[PDB]
Subunit: 726 residues, 4 copies
């Protein structure tokens, strides 16, 4: 036995906070967490304990340390079938990554509606509040490879596979309510422009390069989603703290055959929260797996990601009642005009067992709809329908990708399709065609109906000539970017200006920067002037006189477009760094930990080395990480208890820890002699809003800190951070 | 409902003779036939009855007859996801066929040893007579594509997958005891030479072309297997009536670590039997699926193919005691020197459900051995070990081919291998490496032992320099071809001569024919002179004076090498054509069918049209096929009962049916007025005749059937125009 | 669409890092040639003054829109232009290398200092005036093709020699030894260093339980672990690291004499490495630092040279 | 895509056009063509938008579909005229 006698190799199969135990495959960490889909995967789960090591043919291996050779210092022999099988499997482990959204993190969970939506849709999964639908969700970036970093500036994907009783429904959305382009024909052009440049394959996970901004400057339809990407929306704190959107207008079809237009939404029950750029970029270096880790650990801790499914509903007769085209995916539907109606809740409560088998091999596709839903003529959605089926044939090695365990429906599936690479199903039907008499025509077609009926498309009227033509109704590019801009808080506006300024500063060809500034002048002159100033560009008199675009149906703002204008902060699942010293005041620590625990806020005990430290009362304190090992970037706030402050007062890493957290607008709390640290962050003796200070870490101290954490960041500090060298 | 009210669409789920019912997937035809492997495939079997038609995502389809269009006469829309899924699946159905042995037919069965072989091997599947091992067997040709014909002249493959309690063991053999080449390095050269020529991809399923005979003429090591291919061995009657061989010398390893050399054999319990060349070639045209059909229908009828596994055993100390090298795969071990010891029986008793899923996707590989077995340095076997794993990566789309249901072991399999295309298994092990402490090092290595131990190679002594050199002991090419030749009956010798003569007549470049005749002169002068005569070639004085090769260990023949020298005929499962007339003598028919039933011989009632005919007593006789629809090529014997012979006496197809059967040496039985047919077939040997069909008449016919063919008829068949 | 001042086009002359936009090699340095670079001319495709086409050679009129039934209508299945374009896009990716997936490459040439005919009959080492084109790829080991350059890892240093008597590939690393002794253990070692199976963390890092578990249980790994933990694991540039073949190979001369050999690459720019904090922060600020530095050094005329 | 192993089947010699072919498509299994275009997208300024679209015309023009009238509902229905 190679395991330690104390059993410390095995994580506790119960919820534990981040860092308390080693992470583990979901069925081992949470064996009692189940759903219909998770149970259905049992047939393909492979254990390991108490089993002999074998070849793939079931032959027991005696020596897994050596190749077969002619003498102990001789040549390796071709007859070593064990070596060749092992090396062959290894040599062929890789599969192509997804063209886009290659970097992603996934979890299992469930969905249930609040009430029956039978009135507006015949979709079975929305028919009954007590009907639970298992889900598998993958969150992703867009540009970067599967080995790229999480906290890049990008759009995020939010894909949900619903295992319904009437088929798989895939909700393939993003974290912004619009896309960059209007027609699917341009998707390869846009994606090639944002992706690493062809000659040298630089830059990874970044849109800050010439080709991207060249395309944007030449295709003003991109400006709306570019605004969202340049905002703090482009750098979420967690997959748990971002919104989700289907983007396209789809249709709901009820039993009577009535069509209602719908746009899909996911509301994060943990609230909306994003990083700041310097922190996000640094985090790509310090922990490129930050989001993947945070998701896995939140689930292991019982801080289950929860989202509310919502619908914006528009009657068929209201198709033309807005200033924009409902079928235009570069346009959002302001919630002030069409509210989001609450539909149901999704909870992600179990991690996969094997990332490759379940996450990498998962195939989501927006064409996977069910009776009660339908498409629209949105020309971006239209092209997506072709792409997803197509790409899966090479990525997943054939037309039998639905047989890969994660992708299988939990409901019945029977048809006349046969063969294809890696065919798992063994069909016993004497017939492989229909109509047939030899099997009495089974499996049989099913007429459409209110429940358990066959799929029939909504009989939408089509009138026109065969044309490759953009609708003139889609030819408006500045009003939605402006509405977004005006809906942001002043600090959110600053962050957008900084986003554009940083990105355009990386564009080598100055004329591209000038062309982008010209586009900004068509959106808002304050925005354009601020970006121009940072680039050492002067707006022309013509540019200064560009008439602003129209308001959107009389709206000059919609606060639902801001991350922070309307407080929705929730501290459960957040994390605090506690900076230890070699003689911690145990009374401070007791108060700190008790208060954090009560609000579901985790703590990580940090020091200048690993191991343990002893508190003033003899309590042995285990160290989670070093100041360098777990930087402030990875936490939401920092607390420094009293004790022997002299131990850490001159520690460069401890001082920098506070300077970084300060620069990144995080709440900081200093108890007793820890207030000596106010000098490194230039806090006046009188104090400052966002710095919690007291003689000890009492109830009032912790309440103040937790109130600041509910507000996420100390925006009032922004004017003060420029002076700090961090 | 589209099914007929009488239920005649559905085959009876019970054993029925060939042609009596439509054929069906195995688990519908024989639902109660089971074994551990067949049961383990239940998790992936999909039914159909009473289910709704869906997409692969489980969405019910309302209209599976139409694409989605803008108007009933409009363009098809890109949003039709149902159409695109259906067409996409269809568009991607095909996978690469096998490089060689692409044409094959398979079935499920079981194996059981007669006694424990614990004394000579620790292989678990041979440890106890009560130990039943499920098998999956695939029979094949070599050259032809998956769409080529069955009854070509070729070597046949005979591959057995044993689902053992200690791992999959694949016995990947052929129907001849040797191979064409000595070293695996030449395999692509040989195969390229026999395969269709590169410029034009001709000919299919035929070695009768210039490149094959060019290679043979330049590589005399090929001559032994060429002799077998030119003989009637190259055209088996059925996969049930051919021998099987592992070819290579392998090793058996016992619990004490003793190695015994072994060569594997399969003895057909239905006996050895082959077609004649004209019949075989014409059958490739009339029924290119003849062997596949015969196998499937024998199983459906309960005429289960049975084979006895046998071992030729040679002690390690006897490695050098023969005139040939044991490691040379172009050399056979004469049974007169080393007998075949009976080991066990294999029964094939169930067809697959889906040919593609189970047969096409099956992967056999000779490197798939188990503890108790080992390899030798045979340089052909050595290279095979590399090839099979390799080819399966592209043919079956990745390294997870063992996860394709037919290929899955029935015993446990656990290791640290992960990922790869179409990964099915979801590993829960916290570790994907060893040694590990995080999972207490599981799954763990197992030391070798008497039972349930890990695999350890036999510690064979290796001494020598790193050389790409053929052993001088392999440099003898004519003695085994001569042994084979001398062991054949005179009619078998004639068929060999005719095989070479026909093949070389299709070689365009005359010098290649001359070079092959020169090789034959090194084997036997009678053989060489007979082939030369047929090619209009004269042997030179030098050729006439070539000293014949040496005997093989003093043997000038071994009857075990002949198909027919030692009768081993079995009539069960054979088929007789009964040629009907519009007023059959019912008394003749009763006697015929009763006698055939008693011996398990099947009958097919033939006429000039389909439907029914009425006998002299009013009995309604259903017609199975027409004279043209089911030619004599497809049957073993022909019976013509009495009645209104005038109805068929002038029927060209009926007359030709008998002339073809006559030419092809098949037994023919004529009752009463049917004897009028003797004149039209120019007449002799193996013609049963009497006033009526009875005990005597049928006994005579069945005696002829046990002998397979009427060899005595050969001397004057050349003259018959058929 | 190009600016009238021509600022879109880089100068086809050596320029320092950041002075001009980077460009494809054949456009940046058109007069830099070798036998291999010339032999690739048959497959180089230009673009200027050519019409935009399908892969079948059909000129495209409108590359901005799908074919639809009306300007607000559904997309038609008969749009073969859209489907070809999207199909090619959908199938762009190929599997990355199991190991050394992250790598940066350049063309160059090799020339010996003297004939080595006395110790080897290898043609490319037979004459100091025999120039052998090369293609070199430098890499990390663990990380994906989208991972960062300045990780702590071993670096690959692979050279393809296009010899007159065949391709010789000298596939080495930047340390003189490997972690393991027998190839049978390669999947175990690589699985241990790679992201852990359950959650696929961490990327480009050996700082995790399974790696150190394996190391602790397999002391043969300790020598290369020492090199990886040293500043050798964080090179400043691919130009400032050593290369090694690791294995003992043989040289065979015309007389058939065998000499044992171990291969080395000496950086003529010297040996230099980053410091850990700098390296880790650089993975964040510029994950393409080494790839960029290599490309820009070549564009500047600071050609990487190795002995 | 599966028969010929990828999207570059037009590069297999027998399939290659004899006329010019230039576009912004890149990569794919067994990619033969080495593209030198600084741009892999359009519209682009970095390569003055080359290769460029061509208007339809009498000779050497770009492909444009005939503007056939479309009238009807989205249906999975066989025309009665086919019956
Ligand atoms: C509303 C705009 C869009 C959204 C919200 C969207 C979203 C996504 C998401 C979330 C994924 C990741 C799902 C997964 O893990 O498999 C993805 C994958 C993909 N998308 Fe999109 N997408 C959009 C438009 C497009 C378009 C226009 C195309 C192509 C014409 C496209 C082609 C693909 C392909 C080829 C993949 C990889 C597919 C797979 O391998 O599973 N997407 N998309
Ligand atoms: C004694 C000599 C040989 C015999 C009896 C033999 C027999 C067979 C048989 C029966 C099969 C088809 C099995 C099936 O899939 O149903 C086959 C397949 C094949 N053989 Fe052999 N073979 C011989 C030598 C060789 C050699 C020397 C090579 C290469 C070194 C070779 C390479 C292959 C390959 C690549 C296939 C296809 C394997 C596959 O795709 O499943 N064979 N062989
Ligand atoms: C001294 C030890 C080793 C060295 C120096 C070495 C070096 C390298 C390098 C530099 C590359 C990347 C070449 C490129 O730029 O594409 C590479 C790739 C690879 N190595 Fe090794 N390697 C070592 C050991 C191993 C072992 C023991 C194996 C397998 C049993 C192995 C299997 C591979 C494979 C499969 C790849 C990917 C090959 C490919 O995908 O082109 N390597 N190795």
């Amino acid at each position: 036995s190679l395991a330690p006698e104390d059993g410390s190799h095995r994580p506790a199969a119960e919820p534990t906070p981040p860092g308390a135990q080693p992470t583990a495959p979901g069925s081992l960490k949470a064996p009692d967490t189940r759903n219909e889909k998770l149970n259905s995967l049992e047939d393909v789960r492979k254990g390991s304990e108490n089993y002999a090591l074998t070849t793939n043919q079931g032959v027991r291996i005696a020596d897994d340390q050596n190749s077969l050779r002619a003498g102990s210092r001789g040549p390796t022999l071709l007859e070593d079938f064990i070596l060749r099988e092992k090396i062959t499997h290894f040599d062929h482990e890789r599969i192509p990554e997804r063209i886009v959204h290659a970097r992603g993190s996934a979890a299992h969970g469930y969905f249930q509606p609040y009430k029956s939506l039978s009135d507006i849709t015949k979709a079975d999964f929305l028919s009954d509040p007590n009907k639970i639908t298992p889900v598998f969700v993958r969150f992703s970036t867009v540009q970067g490879g599967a080995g790229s970093a999480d906290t890049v500036r990008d759009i995020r994907g939010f894909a949900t596979k619903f295992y319904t009783e009437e088929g798989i429904f895939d909700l393939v959305g993003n974290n912004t309510p619009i896309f960059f382009i209007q027609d699917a024909h341009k998707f390869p052009d846009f994606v090639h422009a944002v992706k690493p440049e062809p000659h040298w394959a630089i830059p990874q996970g970044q849109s800050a390069h010439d080709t991207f901004w060249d395309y944007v400057s030449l295709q003003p339809e991109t400006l709306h989603n570019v605004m969202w990407a340049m905002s703090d929306r482009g750098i979420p704190r967690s997959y748990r703290t971002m919104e989700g959107f289907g983007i396209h207008t789809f249709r709901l079809i009820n039993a009577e055959g009535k069509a209602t237009f719908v746009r899909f939404h996911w509301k994060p029950l943990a609230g909306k929260a994003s990083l700041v750029w310097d922190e996000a970029q640094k985090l790509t270096g310090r922990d490129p797996d930050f989001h993947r880790r945070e998701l896995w650990e939140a689930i292991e801790a019982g801080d289950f990601p929860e989202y509310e499914l919502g619908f914006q509903l528009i009657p068929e007769e209201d198709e033309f009642k807005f200033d924009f085209d409902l079928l235009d995916p570069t346009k959002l539907i302001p919630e002030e005009l069409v509210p989001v109606q609450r539909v149901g809740k999704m909870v992600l409560n179990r991690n996969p067992d094997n990332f490759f088998a379940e996450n990498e091999q998962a195939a989501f596709h927006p064409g996977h709809i069910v009776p009660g839903l339908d498409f629209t003529n949105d020309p971006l959605l239209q092209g997506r329908l072709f792409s997803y089926t197509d790409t899966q044939i090479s990525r997943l090695g054939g037309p039998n990708f639905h047989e890969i365990p994660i992708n299988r429906p939990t409901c019945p599936y029977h048809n006349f399709q046969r063969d294809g690479m890696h065919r798992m199903g063994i069909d016993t039907n004497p017939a492989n065609y229909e109509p047939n008499s030899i099997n009495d025509n089974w499996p049989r077609e099913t007429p459409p109906g209110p429940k358990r009926g066959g799929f029939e498309s909504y009989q939408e009227r089509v009138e026109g000539n065969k044309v490759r033509e953009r609708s003139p109704s889609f030819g408006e590019y500045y009003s939605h970017p402006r509405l977004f801009w005006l809906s942001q808080t002043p600090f959110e506006q600053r962050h957008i200006v900084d986003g554009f300024s940083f990105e355009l500063s990386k564009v080598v060809r100055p004329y591209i920067r000038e062309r982008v500034v010209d586009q900004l002048a068509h959106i808002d002159l304050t925005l354009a002037q601020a970006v121009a100033k940072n680039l050492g560009i002067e707006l022309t008199d013509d540019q200064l006189n560009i008439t602003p675009p129209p308001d959107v149906n009389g709206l000059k703002k919609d606060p639902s477009l801001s991350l922070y204008a309307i407080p929705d902060g929730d501290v459960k699942g957040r994390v605090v760094a506690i900076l230890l010293n070699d003689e911690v005041r145990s009374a401070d620590l007791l108060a700190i930990l008790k208060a954090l625990k009560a609000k579901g806020v985790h703590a990580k005990l940090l020091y200048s080395r690993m191991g343990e430290v002893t508190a003033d009362d003899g309590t042995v304190l285990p160290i989670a990480a070093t100041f360098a090992g777990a930087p402030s970037l990875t936490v939401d706030a920092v607390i420094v208890p009293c004790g022997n402050i002299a131990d850490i007062a001159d520690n460069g890493d401890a001082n920098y820890y506070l300077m970084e957290a300060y620069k990144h607008l995080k709440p900081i709390a200093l108890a007793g002699d820890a207030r000596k640290f106010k000098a490194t962050i230039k806090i006046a003796d009188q104090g400052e809003e966002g710095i919690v200070e007291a003689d000890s870490a009492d109830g009032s101290f912790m309440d103040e800190l937790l109130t600041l954490m509910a507000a996420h960041r100390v925006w009032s500090r922004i004017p003060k951070i420029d002076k700090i060298p961090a």
